[PDB]
Amino acid sequence: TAPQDIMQSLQSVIEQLDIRRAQVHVEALIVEVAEGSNINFGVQWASKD
């Protein structure tokens, strides 16, 4: 609700803010490659006293 002049302004704003929105599809890719190893080798003795 406004005077005839302000209205014609607010009609060209609303006309330009009413546009159609684009939507986005966002994929993430989480990669992980792990590789372990170990090796253990040793001799032990024991005896009497």
Binding site: P3, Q4, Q8, S9, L10, S12, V13, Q16, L17
Partner: protein, 45 residues
């Protein structure tokens, strides 16, 4: 003498037929349509 009527959006004018000529020509320019550009613009960033 000029008085404005809100409802019908119209201007009441008074004077002899020569004076009511000028204000009738000057009101046709002040009623001319603005081109697309008000005091408000919309900038898409």
């Amino acid at each position: 003498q000029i008085v404005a009527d809100e409802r019908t959006n119209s201007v009441i004018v008074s004077g002899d037929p020569a004076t009511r000529d000028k204000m009738r020509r000057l009101i046709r320019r002040l009623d001319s349509e603005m081109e697309r550009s008000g005091n408000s613009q919309v900038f898409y960033l």
